[PDB]
Design a protein around this ligand. Structure first.
Ligand SMILES: COc1ccc(-c2noc(CSc3nnc(C)n3-c3ccc(OC)cc3)n2)cc1
Ligand SMILES: [Zn+2]
Length: 204
């Protein structure tokens, strides 16, 4: 099963993960409707997800992609936000749970911006917010997001909203255009870091 390795705040790895999360906050077109209003997060903890079977599947797929991408994985660290974090860390990403309504079809969506992933933690459009207060901008309830290793391989550049089931022939991912990073096989992502946090209320 899954083991969670507790990273200390004094560690460079904890600091690089938090720095990537904090520096990638952006203003979103919905004016904060989905994810809430904030300029920074309060990071509660950062844990490394260790699972032998999940690593094996990730390794297995990585090699196939590498063989088809002139010996390159084209790995990227990307954020993922969804109400399925707990299942993902135990069972792995699963394309049978791909977002069907996604702009680039039934895939698993990742982002360079942590604030983009925060919009999905409580559901599509932020759902009804946290279970306790029904608040999409809740400053109390703890949230979770993942900072993932994503095997992109040969990315297909998509500009039109198209409903793809799988990556196009000879490709391993879709970069849909801010860019949306999409994979269609759960084994092309490893949920490396589990980030537990709160959004913080800006000074009035
Ligand atoms: C029960 O066990 C499991 C095991 C695995 C998963 C899982 N694996 O990938 C995903 C992507 S969800 C996703 N990927 N991109 C988006 C966007 N969303 C998403 C986000 C929020 C949402 O809210 C209801 C639905 C889909 N979910 C789910 C459940
Ligand atoms: Zn709440």
């Amino acid at each position: 099963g899954t083991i969670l390795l507790d990273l200390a705040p004094e560690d460079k790895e904890y600091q690089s993960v938090e720095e990537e999360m904090q520096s990638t906050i952006r203003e979103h077109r919905d004016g904060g409707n989905a994810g809430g209003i904030f300029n920074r997060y309060n990071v509660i903890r950062i844990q490394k997800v260790v699972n032998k079977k999940l690593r094996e599947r990730f390794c297995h797929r990585q090699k196939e992609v590498s063989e088809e991408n002139h010996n390159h994985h084209n790995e990227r660290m990307l954020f993922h936000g969804s109400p399925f974090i707990n299942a993902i860390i135990h069972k792995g990403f699963d394309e049978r749970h791909a977002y069907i309504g996604g702009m680039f079809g039934a895939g698993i969506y990742f982002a360079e911006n942590s604030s983009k992933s925060n919009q999905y933690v409580y559901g599509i459009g932020g759902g009804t917010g946290c279970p306790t207060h029904k608040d999409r901008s809740c400053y109390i309830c703890h949230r979770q997001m993942l900072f993932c290793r994503v095997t992109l391989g040969k990315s297909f550049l998509q500009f039109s909203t198209i409903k793809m089931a799988h990556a196009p022939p000879g490709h391993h991912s879709v970069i849909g255009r801010y860019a949306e990073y999409v994979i269609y096989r759960g084994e092309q992502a490893y949920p490396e870091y589990l980030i537990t946090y709160q959004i913080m209320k800006p000074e009035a």
